[PDB]
Amino acid sequence: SATAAPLLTSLSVTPSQLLAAVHSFATPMVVAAAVVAVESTTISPNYN
């Protein structure tokens, strides 16, 4: 239960498992790097 969750280990009582073994996702996820762009450049005093 939500009420008893932060006390199980503090009271030294073993939480009860439900599944036989942990469930892993079917397919792995490919994470590519974020894209970074130099979008603008400015000159503080400029002729043009």
Name the resolution in angstroms.
3.0
For 12, the 3-state DSSP assignment is coil
How was this model experimentally determined?
cryo-EM
Tokens of 8: 């199980």
- Alpha-carbon distance values, 24 to 2, 7, 17, 19, 21 (Å): 24, 27, 16, 12, 9
Contact 15, 8 (CB under 8 A): yes
Q: Which helix (H) or strand (E) holds 23?
A: none
CA dihedral 11, 13, 18, 19 (to 10 degrees): 110
